Design a protein around this ligand. Structure first.
Ligand SMILES: *[C@@H]1O[C@H](CO)[C@@H](O)[C@H](O)[C@H]1NC(C)=O
Ligand SMILES: *[C@@H]1O[C@H](CO)[C@@H](O)[C@H](O)[C@H]1NC(C)=O
Lengths: 188, 12, 177
């Protein structure tokens, strides 16, 4: 029931095209509001609110600190990038694709084809449905990209359809860990 | 291979 | 392309501190404050990199000191509670008698304080459960994962109970075969 008081700081390193373009951000929060901020595109602290003006001015008076922050894109961002490059930037985990039917309403027939794509990394994924070699773009609902919190992702891409005997449905998956599209078929 | 912490700066 | 975040916070009066490293939404490691030891999200990370926990403990002292300054300068304005959004799901499709893992995703909340309890048929579970620290978001809020490895059966139902100061009643998200 007592009041809470939170101090929260983030030091962000943003990488584009490997380490060719690197951006460094420092952010200071109290409770829910950002007050001070260092942006490598500026090279100085700036006040986000009037509450953070004393810290920005005082910090901008310390030349030794501004030089540390201005060099972070190299001494901090690019350094830490190379430390874990082998098991983060280059981490690759193949997807596990399975198809199984389901039902929109318990008392109705199987009118829902689920394409489960789980256990992959990174989060990038593209899934497509096909009826008899033609792509089905209408009637597709999905959970979206689900982060499992353990360096793996999953997603369900479902197709609302009435399967007819003889028809073949194909779930096609594209992921940076595989070269050619991955296909799984389901026959009625 | 050793990670580096940014150092926190004391406020006014 | 890629983002690396170093997130640290200190909370009063709970006196809770955290220091962690993020890579595109995932945890590389966090510094255990009591043990003063670098905990890697995946054991294999420790074999490829390192980090001296003393740097984190040093930053947490500064953050603790800055909190006192900002609490005074802000005239002791308390934080506004933001209740969490809770989701329960499984690591993979569910096959009977085939091991799996229930995942409770607590999202979009502040301050970073939550009690999370796994319930099997209403009874608490305190064996086999694991949990991550508070993870950063793009919008100054926090998220958190809890895990319950289980053997799927038709006789067992599960509930993830979450309690947050921004919640009137504790949240219960359900899951069953
Ligand atoms: C705290 O109180 C003083 C008035 O005594 C005021 O000048 C100051 O701005 C207040 N802090 C705020 C508005 O953040
Ligand atoms: C968690 O449980 C403890 C003991 O019941 C309680 O004191 C605390 O307020 C709870 N935390 C939240 C956020 O509800």
């Amino acid at each position: 029931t007592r009041p809470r008081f939170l101090e929260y700081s983030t030091s962000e390193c943003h990488f584009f095209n490997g380490t060719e373009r690197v951006r460094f951000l420092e952010r200071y929060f109290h409770n829910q509001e950002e007050n001070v901020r260092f942006d490598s595109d500026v090279g100085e602290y700036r006040a986000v609110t009037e509450l953070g003006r004393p810290d920005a001015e005082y910090w901008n008076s310390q030349k030794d600190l501004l030089e540390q922050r201005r060099a972070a894109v190299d001494t901090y961002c690019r350094h830490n990038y190379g430390v874990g490059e082998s098991f983060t930037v280059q981490r690759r985990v193949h997807p596990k694709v399975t198809v199984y039917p389901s039902k929109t309403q318990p008392l109705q027939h199987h009118n829902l084809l689920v394409c489960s794509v789980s256990g992959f990394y990174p989060g990038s994924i593209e899934v497509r449905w096909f009826r008899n070699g033609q792509e089905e773009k209408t009637g597709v609902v999905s959970t979206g990209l689900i982060h499992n919190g353990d360096w793996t992702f999953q997603t369900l891409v479902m197709l609302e359809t009435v399967p007819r005997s003889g028809e073949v449905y194909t779930c096609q998956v594209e992921h940076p860990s595989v070269t050619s599209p991955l296909t799984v078929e389901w026959r009625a | 291979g050793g990670y580096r912490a940014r150092p926190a700066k004391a406020a006014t | 392309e890629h983002v690396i975040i170093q997130a640290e916070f200190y909370l009063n009066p709970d006196q809770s501190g955290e220091f962690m490293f993020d890579f595109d939404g995932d945890e590389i490691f966090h510094v255990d404050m009591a043990k003063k030891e670098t905990v890697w999200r995946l054991e294999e990370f420790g074999r490829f990199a390192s980090f001296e926990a003393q740097g984190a403990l040093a930053n947490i002292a500064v953050d603790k000191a800055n909190l006192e300054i900002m609490t005074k300068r802000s005239n002791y304005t308390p934080i506004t509670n933001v209740p969490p959004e809770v989701t329960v799901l499984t690591n993979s499709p569910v096959e009977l008698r085939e091991p799996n893992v229930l995942i409770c995703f607590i999202d979009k909340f502040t301050p970073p304080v939550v009690n999370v309890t796994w319930l099997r048929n209403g009874k608490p579970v305190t064996t086999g459960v694991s949990e991550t620290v508070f993870l950063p978001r793009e919008d100054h809020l926090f998220r958190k994962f809890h895990y319950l490895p289980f053997l799927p059966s038709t006789e067992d139902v599960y509930d993830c109970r979450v309690e947050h100061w921004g919640l009137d009643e504790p949240l219960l998200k359900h899951w069953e075969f």
